[PDB]
């Protein structure tokens, strides 16, 4: 898509104070603080009048909050079920692998709003394994259509494919 790329690139332009106030708004809707809504409006309004396709609003808000909290860099080919699974091969299959594996499968049966904390723990173990790159555009357009089961099964089969290799 040619609309989400501008959103991710504009997010990468954000300076320290803006993503600090985005960091402070974890688990909080974009209403109880005025500056957070102002920042989201500035990020989210001008990309609908230049390109016809835009992500969903809740996906954009959640992705902005998570991006502020973790601060990765955008790189093609680094979606969640590849780096996930790649880290699962670096594990003991007896005990820890079912633990981390269940932590990953918790994402596949959740709605967009409640995934903030499971995505937080998944990206926390990603940060523990020193992962710098994450395809924010790829994550965003597989998350804006997260409610159709073909993309969920494709994401899971990507995890399988990265695990068997």
């Amino acid at each position: 898509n040619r609309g989400t790329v501008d959103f991710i690139a504009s997010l990468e332009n954000l300076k320290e104070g803006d993503l600090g106030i985005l960091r402070k708004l974890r688990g909080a809707r974009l209403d109880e603080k005025l500056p957070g809504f102002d920042l989201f409006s500035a990020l989210w309004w001008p990309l609908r009048q230049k390109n016809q396709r835009a992500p969903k609003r809740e996906v954009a808000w959640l992705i902005a909050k998570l991006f502020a909290e973790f601060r990765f860099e955008q790189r093609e080919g680094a979606t969640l079920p590849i780096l996930m699974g790649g880290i699962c091969r670096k594990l003991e299959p007896k005990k820890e692998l079912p633990r981390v594996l269940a932590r990953f499968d918790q994402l596949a049966s959740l709605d967009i709003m409640q995934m903030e904390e499971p995505l937080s723990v998944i990206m926390g173990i990603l940060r523990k394994h020193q992962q710098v790159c994450l395809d924010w555009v790829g994550l965003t357009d597989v998350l804006s259509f997260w409610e159709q089961e073909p993309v969920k099964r494709e994401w899971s089969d990507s995890f399988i494919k990265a695990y068997k290799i």
């Binding site: 809707r29 005990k95 633990r99 049966s109 959740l110 709605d111 709003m113």
Partner: protein, 368 residues
């Protein structure tokens, strides 16, 4: 005539029921995962509840000969009892046998000890087992009995063991997406050592959910299996109402003391029962205002509205009840002012439902 009893219970983080692997029970209701509590666990916990002790009169045992041998000071009859049972039809110490406790105790003791026969002794023991219907827990939960046809005698028969269940407990369906949570526990070794580690690193899974609990009484069946009397039937209905509102499943309560109480009672008298599972086909997602209990009650009251007008049964109206304690949780917050007798107690609703049952009172019936 049959009685519906509905509850909406929110519970603390707890594991009231597990499968073989230890996970809380789950069902795919409405295309999403819903937390489940098994009906048999609820039936057992209400059976073993602290108010059913005046009415707890059913035993489900395979050690019948042990029960005979306990009530005999010096007359050892445990091999003779075992062979009498083994040619009764049970083949081994046996399979599971349902009966009344005191009846089998005393009169199987008197019918077993006498040295008058061995074949007809087994036949009359089997007849005593089959006639053991004077117990209302058997009348509620139900019981059949199937002995073997191989390890038996051709001269031993069995009467019709038909007992219908007068209770249909539904499985407690969660009112939202189930969020199964993983608990990580260790076991401390009390004495120290070099390793400074745990005695047993283990797995436990717990689920905090607002359960839609649903029971149903077949009062007509409850008296067609408890003979012509109605006093014991009214006492059992009141005892179940008290027990269900008062007791909880005895799962991992020592580790999760979730003894929270039902935040909703809906008793409606009709000849066509209904579960409000379709009240929560849409998963309940909470908003910033109110809480999960209120949103669940709101969706339930919306469903009660369009099944009291769209599916209206004004030939037999609803006598829909509540347990809203001093009106803490009202039902009709926007339109549903059809709760005819919204109260804030439990003995009052017990007395009311036995009043529409017939001419009974709460205190007088509580003596059978």
């Amino acid at each position: 005539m049959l009685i519906e009893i509905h509850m909406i219970q929110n519970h603390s983080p707890a594991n009231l029921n597990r499968d073989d692997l230890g996970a809380p029970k789950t069902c795919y209701f409405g295309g999403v995962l819903r937390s489940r509590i098994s009906s048999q666990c609820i039936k057992r916990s209400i059976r073993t509840s602290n108010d059913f002790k005046a009415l707890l009169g059913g035993v489900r045992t395979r050690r019948l000969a042990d029960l005979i041998q306990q009530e005999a000071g010096e007359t050892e009859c445990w091999k003779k009892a075992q062979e009498i049972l083994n040619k009764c039809g049970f083949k081994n110490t046996k399979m599971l046998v349902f009966m009344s406790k005191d009846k089998i105790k005393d009169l199987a003791r008197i019918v077993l000890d006498n040295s008058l026969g061995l074949t007809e002794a087994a036949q009359q023991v089997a007849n005593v087992i089959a006639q053991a219907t004077l117990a209302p827990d058997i009348a509620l939960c139900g019981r059949m009995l199937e002995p073997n046809d191989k390890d038996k005698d051709k001269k031993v028969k069995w009467s019709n063991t038909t007992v219908e269940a007068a209770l249909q407990v539904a499985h407690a369906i969660s009112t939202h997406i189930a969020r199964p949570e993983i608990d990580y526990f260790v076991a401390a070794d009390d004495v120290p050592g070099e390793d400074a580690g745990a005695g047993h690193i283990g797995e436990s899974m717990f689920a905090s959910a607002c359960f839609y609990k649903y029971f149903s009484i077949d009062w007509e069946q409850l008296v067609k299996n408890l003979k012509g009397d109605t006093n014991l039937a009214a006492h059992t209905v009141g005892a179940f109402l008290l027990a269900a509102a008062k007791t909880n499943p005895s799962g991992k309560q020592n580790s999760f003391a979730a003894h929270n109480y039902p935040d909703g009672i809906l008793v409606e008298f009709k000849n066509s029962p209904i579960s409000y599972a379709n009240a929560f086909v849409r998963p309940v997602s909470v908003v910033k205002e109110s809480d999960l209990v209120e949103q669940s009650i709101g969706q339930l009251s919306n469903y009660v509205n369009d099944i009291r007008l769209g599916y209206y049964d004004e030939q037999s109206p609803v006598i829909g009840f509540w347990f809203s304690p001093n009106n803490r949780y009202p039902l009709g917050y926007k339109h549903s002012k059809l709760a005819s007798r919204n109260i804030g107690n439990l003995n009052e609703l017990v007395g009311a439902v036995l009043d529409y049952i017939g001419g009974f009172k709460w205190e007088e019936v509580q003596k059978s």
